[PDB]
């Protein structure tokens, strides 16, 4: 019943609560994805450094139903609500039209949801930002990146984590046509892109791949290790 | 620091400032006197006609409510008109509910606790309108009451609210109060209104009267219209 208008226009058209959510996604993990023309691939910042973690419940890589899956970046507990409501309405859109639900529609639902929390009475618009990847009825490995202002863009790298302005300018530099193959050059580009920032994949990185509406497979320390090795060998 | 601006906050000496700021908000508005006598209550309201563009009765300030009680109001006409129409709804619920025609003491206590219970919350402002009632049933006596924005309601004889109530209370006190038969005091009301109006500057004192009496049998009329050319002949008692 709390009805104070929080998200209000200040002077010079600046909607301060949303830009405060922009630092709130600037102070998270370092998520990254590549649309690799037959495959899609993610990667964020490993964990920290497991030591005493459980790797099963440190998942920045989340699955929506089977094909679309997202990597949030920021506040890591307001995200899980958006995961749950994405899964719920995604099952409702399996109820009505009965498709392998298109990635455009669910990312419009996420962006419309966060924009509906930039409007309602006193509820602090989210500090998350997504990487909605996936497929559709005919291949088309579309990636989407949302925003706490509820603006989604259909771009192809969108490194939107914490130290990821360097990663997206690197991915601006080093993604033209060399990653059109099956998986190896794409995943090599991702693990090269996150090994720009931190350190070896035996403690830090973790990834996930998705191939043609089957087999959302994560990569155990093995995958990350291999990737790192390949990257080092190439460089 | 800043114990003002909210009706739910007291002063450090117990004085809710949103009420006394509403009280001066009727002290910057014109007078409306009401004089009780044995055959009923006579109202008279000062008018402060701004331009020639407003016609006669541009804003009613002698409303009526229940076909016998009246509404000489003082302050903001929006707020006074609001509680006038819910007083109409209140006597509507009494006559519909209990059948018997509403005695005025219960209506003044009811509207009084309405406008009082409306000054206990920071989610509302107080009203900015003093106003008075008045009627008589065949066995009631000429009951009139007056209600502040604080919500207190007193029975009076000759109460006067408005800007020049500091002047107006003196002549009503020196007028013989109890035993005259209301027609003369309709005439005598103009003497009070012409004394308390101390300008000629663009306000024109174009007054207005209404009463309830044995010439009315528990009703209201703007005067009928003849004392407006008979009590107008009490000029030069304010010019000499």
């Amino acid at each position: 019943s709390y009805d104070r208008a929080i998200t209000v226009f200040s002077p010079d058209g600046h909607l301060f609560q949303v830009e405060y959510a922009q630092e709130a996604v600037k102070k998270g993990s370092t998520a990254v994805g590549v649309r690799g023309r037959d495959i899609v691939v993610l990667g964020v910042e490993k964990k920290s450094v497991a030591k005493l973690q459980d790797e099963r419940t440190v998942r920045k890589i989340c699955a929506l139903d089977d094909n679309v899956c997202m990597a949030f970046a920021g506040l890591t507990a307001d995200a899980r609500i958006v995961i749950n409501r994405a899964r719920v309405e995604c099952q409702s859109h399996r109820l009505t039209v009965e498709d392998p639900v298109t990635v455009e529609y669910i990312t419009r639902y996420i962006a419309s949801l966060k924009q509906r929390y930039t409007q309602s009475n006193g509820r602090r618009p989210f500090g998350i930002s997504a990487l909605i990847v996936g497929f559709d009825f005919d291949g088309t490995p579309r990636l989407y990146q949302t925003d706490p202002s509820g603006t989604y863009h259909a771009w192809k790298a969108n490194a939107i984590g914490r130290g990821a302005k360097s990663v997206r300018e690197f991915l601006e530099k080093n993604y033209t046509d060399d990653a059109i193959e099956t998986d190896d050059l794409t995943i090599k580009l991702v693990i090269k892109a996150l090994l720009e920032v931190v350190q070896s994949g035996g403690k830090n990185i973790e990834l996930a791949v998705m191939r043609r509406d089957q087999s959302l497979k994560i990569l155990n320390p093995e995958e990350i290790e291999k990737y790192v090795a390949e990257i080092e060998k190439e460089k | 620091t800043g114990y003002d601006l909210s009706a739910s906050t007291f002063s450090p000496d117990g004085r809710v400032f949103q009420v006394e700021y509403a009280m001066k908000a009727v002290e910057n508005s014109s007078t409306a006197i009401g004089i009780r006598c044995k055959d009923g209550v006579v109202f008279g309201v000062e008018k402060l006609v701004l331009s020639k563009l407003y016609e006669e009765g541009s804003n009613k300030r002698l409303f009526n409510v229940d076909r016998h009680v009246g509404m000489a109001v003082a302050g903001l006409l929006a707020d006074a008109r609001s509680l006038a129409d819910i007083a109409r709804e209140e006597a509507s619920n009494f006559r519909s509910n209990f059948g018997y025609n509403i005695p005025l003491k219960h209506l003044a206590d009811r509207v009084a606790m309405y406008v009082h219970a409306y000054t206990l919350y920071s989610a509302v402002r107080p009203f900015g309108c003093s106003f008075m009632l008045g009627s008589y049933s065949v066995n009631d006596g000429a009951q009139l009451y007056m209600i502040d924005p604080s919500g207190v309601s007193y029975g009076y004889w000759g109460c006067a609210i408005g800007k020049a109530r500091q002047a107006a209370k003196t002549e009503i006190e020196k007028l013989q109060m109890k035993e005259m038969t209301c027609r003369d005091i309709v005439k005598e009301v103009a003497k009070i209104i012409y004394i308390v109006h101390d300008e000629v500057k663009d306000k024109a004192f174009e007054l207005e009267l209404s009463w309830v009496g044995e010439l009315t049998n528990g009703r209201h009329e703007i005067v009928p219209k003849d004392i407006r050319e008979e009590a107008e002949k009490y000029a030069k008692e304010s010019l000499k």
């Binding site: - | 909210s6 700021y21 001066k24 541009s58 929006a78 920071s122 509302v124 402002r125």
Partner: protein, 238 residues
């Protein structure tokens, strides 16, 4: 610190002032100028329409509400349209239930009780629009200024809007030729009352002037860009 009467349709300035619903009266002083008046037979409305663009319909002011109870807004426009969907809808509701024309006085009084509620309660701005409603009920064709302070006026020949005080002081000293002066010579007498609020250089063109006529044996009729051209005369050089 500076002005603690800014959290403020609940508060009172210490003299008498409610401190922003008179400031809504400022917010209709800022709006565009208009003028309505009444005869013994039929009341008229005249409005000049501001063109703050390339060119436009110039944000059409006078509105059809009714079945002879027409209005003339000034101030905000979306809030005006909300208030005339209210006034419109319950005027049609009085067409529905009682099956008579809703009288103009009860119309303007109950909107005077509808725009009075947000002046009362908390965190709700007043309806910042100054209506200049005009209609022909059973007796003579009334005309009501109402205000965002919820205090209407049973007036004749009122002008509200930007520098409309000069139009009033023309129109105050020309009341003697009202209660006569039929439609052809009445609306000329209103346009030369409107042709003082203009910045001393400008024709009442056919573009910006939209008027409305209501009264005996005629519907509230809107004269737009074309139909105002048979009303033509004056100089005033004003």
């Amino acid at each position: 610190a500076a002005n603690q009467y800014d959290n403020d349709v609940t508060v009172w300035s210490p003299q008498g002032r409610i401190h922003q619903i008179e400031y809504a009266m400022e917010a209709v002083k800022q709006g565009s100028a208009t003028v309505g008046l009444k005869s013994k037979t039929h009341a008229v409305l005249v409005a000049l329409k501001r063109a703050q663009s390339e060119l436009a319909a110039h944000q059409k002011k006078i509105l059809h509400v009714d079945n002879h109870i027409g209005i003339s807004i000034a101030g905000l426009t979306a809030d005006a349209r909300l208030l005339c969907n209210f006034m419109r809808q319950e005027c049609l509701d009085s067409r529905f239930v009682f099956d008579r024309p809703l009288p103009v006085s009860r119309l303007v009084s109950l909107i005077g009780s509808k725009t009075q509620i947000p002046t009362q309660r908390y965190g709700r701005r007043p309806y910042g629009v100054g209506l200049l409603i005009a209609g022909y009920d059973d007796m003579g064709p009334h005309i009501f200024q109402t205000c965002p302070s919820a205090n209407y006026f049973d007036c004749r020949a009122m002008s509200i809007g930007a520098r409309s005080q000069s139009a009033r002081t023309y129109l105050e000293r020309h009341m003697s030729e009202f209660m006569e002066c039929n439609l052809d010579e009445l609306v000329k007498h209103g346009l030369r009352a409107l042709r003082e609020t203009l910045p001393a250089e400008q024709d009442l063109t056919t573009k910006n002037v939209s008027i409305g006529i209501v009264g005996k044996d005629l519907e509230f009729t809107i004269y737009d860009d074309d139909d105002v051209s048979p009303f033509l005369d004056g100089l005033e050089e004003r």
